[PDB]
Amino acid sequence: KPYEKVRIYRMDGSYRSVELKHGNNTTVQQIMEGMRLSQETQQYFTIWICSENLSLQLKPYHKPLQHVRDWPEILAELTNLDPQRETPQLFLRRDVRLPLEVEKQIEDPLAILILFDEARYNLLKGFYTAPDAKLITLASLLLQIVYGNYESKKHKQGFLNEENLKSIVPVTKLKSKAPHWTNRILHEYKNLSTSEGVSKEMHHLQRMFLQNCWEIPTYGAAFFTGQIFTKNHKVIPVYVGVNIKGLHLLNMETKALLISLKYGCFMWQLGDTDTCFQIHSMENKMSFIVHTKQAGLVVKLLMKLNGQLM
Amino acid sequence: MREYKLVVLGSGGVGKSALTVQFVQGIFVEKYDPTIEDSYRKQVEVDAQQCMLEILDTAGTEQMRDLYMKNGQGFALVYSITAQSTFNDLQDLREQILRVKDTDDVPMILVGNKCDLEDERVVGKEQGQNLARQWNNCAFLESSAKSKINVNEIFYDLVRQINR
Ligand SMILES: Nc1nc2c(ncn2[C@@H]2O[C@H](COP(=O)(O)OP(=O)(O)NP(=O)(O)O)[C@@H](O)[C@H]2O)c(=O)[nH]1
Ligand SMILES: *Cc1c(O)ccc2ccc(-c3ccco3)cc12
Ligand SMILES: [Mg+2]
């Protein structure tokens, strides 16, 4: 073939090969045009570059293959990792700046499906902290979406083991809280199928799944890695989630929600040597400091997402 | 959960992407965008067991065709009942697959697409059955991505042919 190409993956493992009309000088915007997307679908998504431990949203003017070429230097600036075990790939993902009010008016079936796969991926990974009731509802919708209608001859007993459970509940709960949710999951699953008041069209069911995900505090969040010190002093690895709602802190080991702060209920300050940033939570008389080489990006994203709010 | 690697082959325009997108995403791609190489993933239930399908949607021409054959487990051979040339091209593809797999026991299915355009039909249903008969009683199906006719059966039958 007399042309260059690149794979653009999605969270579900699928990919789409696009032509590279300008080689490594092709931009995100030119690649975005190379997909099977309309201007309707394109406004909700953008190209990300992600390895195992670093995910970066790119901009229309960015040249993604030069980011691939420069990945070991980028990992050295932003992480404390060895660049060898990290090869990046390009992904089509939700725009982190996409306001929730705009997502709530989406009707395109393809856009709904792409947003649904990302949300399901973040759920099973354990990044979406929700009460046990919200998680059971999401698991029953996944059963309807993936396994079709409920049938007592098939799903009543000896079906929701752990291999099937792993695909509908967060991995952080599969061992502890999940094996006691099975009866409550099937009852909602049974209720979803035998109910004409609920549309079983595929884009409608996925739209329902996303509705229950929109109330989750960490929905649509871009995640960064960092470190906090216990108030004798013990290091706690953390995920720093920054979305259109605010800022959230996850225990890196167990994904437990440490603190979640809506915009306008806290203030931020970038550290001196950049290696950190401070969060003063007003109306609580409490502050904390997060150490991370990505602290510059966290603060820069916090300003843009806060400035977006009216 | 067993994984199945299926490859959709055929000349350009026959609806390889339309059949795949309809099966995986339930959407009918009305536009025409010549494919470079697309890979889809989908979990289905074939004969009361959960399967994981990786479906490779290939280009009409161009070229890496031998890599697809050596790695693929089942092959959907697609033509359009609207274009005779797309029907004739399938004999070379059938022989290429047998040559690379070095056998005739290859999971395979012949798919005549665009049966919703019954008016503009050029290839007959009996001539398609006659080809599949010649091909060691190969499976045969007439399908339509627009009307969602025989779409799910194309990939379900390839899964059963791999389980044997
Ligand atoms: N009426 C009708 N049109 C169809 C059907 N299947 C595909 N088409 C149309 O045929 C055109 C080509 O379809 P496409 O899926 O891209 O075929 P392809 O085999 O993937 N082409 P390529 O090999 O170049 O990638 C599109 O305009 C599509 O809408 C069908 O069952 N009925
Ligand atoms: C840096 C930046 C600006 O200036 C505007 C909008 C942005 C949106 C998303 C990011 C980001 C997500 C992960 C890493 O960076 C940055 C960004
Ligand atoms: Mg195609």
Author numbering:
A (entry chain A): 417 to 647, 652 to 730
B (entry chain B): 1 to 63, 67 to 167
Cite, word for word, the article reporting this structure.
To evaluate the potential of the HNA as a site-directing fragment to identify HEG1-KRIT1 PPI inhibitors with potentially improved binding affinity and inhibition activity, we synthesized and screened a series of HNA derivatives bearing substitutions at the C6 or C7 position of the naphthalene ring. The C6 and C7 positions were selected for substitutions as an analysis of the available HNA-KRIT1 co-crystal structure indicated that these two positions may provide opportunities for analogs with improved complementarity to the HEG1 binding region of KRIT1. The co-crystal structures of 3, 5, and 6 in complex with KRIT1 revealed that these compounds exhibit similar binding modes as the parent HNA fragment, including the presence of the imine adduct between the aldehyde moiety of the HNA derivative and the ε-amino group of Lys720. However, compared to the unsubstituted HNA, derivatives 3, 5, and 6 established additional interactions with KRIT1. Additionally, both furan derivatives 5 and 6 were involved in hydrogen−π interactions with KRIT1 Gln473. Interestingly, the binding positions in the three crystal structures appeared nearly identical with the HNA binding pose generated in the MD simulations. Thus, the X-ray and activity data indicate that the binding affinity of the HNA for KRIT1, and the consequent inhibition activity of this fragment in the HEG1–KRIT1 PPI assay, respond to elements of SARs, and in turn highlight the importance of structure complementarity and templating effects in promoting the formation of specific and relatively stable imine adducts with KRIT1 Lys720.
